Amino acid sequence: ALDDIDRILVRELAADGRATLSELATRAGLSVSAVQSRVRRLESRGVVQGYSARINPEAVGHLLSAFVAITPLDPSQPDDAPARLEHIEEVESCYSVAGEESYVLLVRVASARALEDLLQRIRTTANVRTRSTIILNTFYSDRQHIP
Amino acid sequence: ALDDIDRILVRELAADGRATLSELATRAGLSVSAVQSRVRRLESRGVVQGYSARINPEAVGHLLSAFVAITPLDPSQPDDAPARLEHIEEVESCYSVAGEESYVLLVRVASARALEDLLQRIRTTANVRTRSTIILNTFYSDRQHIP
Numbered sequence: 199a200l201d202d203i204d205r206i207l208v209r210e211l212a213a214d215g216r217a218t219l220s221e222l223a224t225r226a227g228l229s230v231s232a233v234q235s236r237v238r239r240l241e242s243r244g245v246v247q248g249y250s251a252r253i254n255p256e257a258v259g260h261l262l263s264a265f266v267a268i269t270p271l272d273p274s275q276p277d278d279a280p281a282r283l284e285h286i287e288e289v290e291s292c293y294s295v296a297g298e299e300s301y302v303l304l305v306r307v308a309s310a311r312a313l314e315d316l317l318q319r320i321r322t323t324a325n326v327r328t329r330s331t332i333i334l335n336t337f338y339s340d341r342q343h344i345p
Numbered sequence: 346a347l348d349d350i351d352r353i354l355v356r357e358l359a360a361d362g363r364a365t366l367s368e369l370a371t372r373a374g375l376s377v378s379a380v381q382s383r384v385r386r387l388e389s390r391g392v393v394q395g396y397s398a399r400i401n402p403e404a405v406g407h408l409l410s411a412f413v414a415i416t417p418l419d420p421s422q423p424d425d426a427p428a429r430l431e432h433i434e435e436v437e438s439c440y441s442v443a444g445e446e447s448y449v450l451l452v453r454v455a456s457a458r459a460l461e462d463l464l465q466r467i468r469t470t471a472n473v474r475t476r477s478t479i480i481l482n483t484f485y486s487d488r489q490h491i492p
């Protein structure tokens with residue numbers, strides 16, 4: 199249910215999430231009130247899920263980032279795993295995945311020793327084995343595409 | 346130095362990209378001017394590198410997401426795959442990696458059949474083999490943590 203006007207707003211808000219209603223208005227050719235109300239409607243269906251500053255993880259001390267694939271040590275209860283790892287703050291994302299493993303997390307930590315410690319917390323808190331792939335370099339990311 | 350006033354700011358801006366110079370400044374103990382200063386400096390120093398609304402990809406036509414793990418076929422050519430792929434736009438994220446493959450892509454696409462197409466285009470444009478993993482569900486995504 200997304201018309202061309204909304205297509206223009208989200209593409210803009212993707213590029214600039216601090217875009218102002220007035221800047222948006224003159225870009226879709228609408229009144230600042232038209233825009234405001236459009237934007238909240240986008241927001242309240244779950245088309246826009248929030249706004250975030252995109253922080254440099256190295257600058258705040260996260261020098262090591264890794265993908266960790268996790269699989270149930272044994273898969274008989276439905277899966278707690280996302281729920282119970284929500285309160286580990288160093289886990290940034292959590293996807294279920296088709297194939298041999300069940301979830302893939304992306305994880306951000308200060309150093310190698312801090313990674314080893316974190317893998318222990320993960321193994322123990324969701325009762326899961328882990329396969330780790332360290333990121334050496336991010337070429338670009340969250341480059342959100344609106345068609 | 347990340348002065349733990351600069352530290353309080355980024356935690357604020359990561360949870361809220363449109364939090365406003367004022368509503369910040371209050372929770373931050375400050376003038377709406379030295380708020381505005383660091384914020385301009387924090388962006389200048391590469392610490393906050395941009396603001397983005399977070400759009401739901403289904404909502405916008407991307408019903409299938411995938412991690413796609415690529416390795417170049419000819420080790421005697423310059424290894425420039427991130428750069429060769431950068432204009433392909435459904436590649437949201439491109440990360441080099443220490444594992445079995447050389448990079449991982451997060452890629453978003455209309456349908457399973459559209460994915461087959463994209464992969465073919467990835468293979469012919471970098472000169473890479475592709476191994477891909479399908480995301481069934483995102484439990485959470487980009488929860489950024491500031492020590």
Ligand SMILES: N[C@@H](Cc1c[nH]c2ccccc12)C(=O)O
Pocket residue numbers: 270273277294295296297298299300301481
């Ligand atoms: N990896 C499983 C799918 C899966 C997703 N989440 C899970 C949680 C537990 C066990 C399996 C799963 C498969 O490909 O079929």
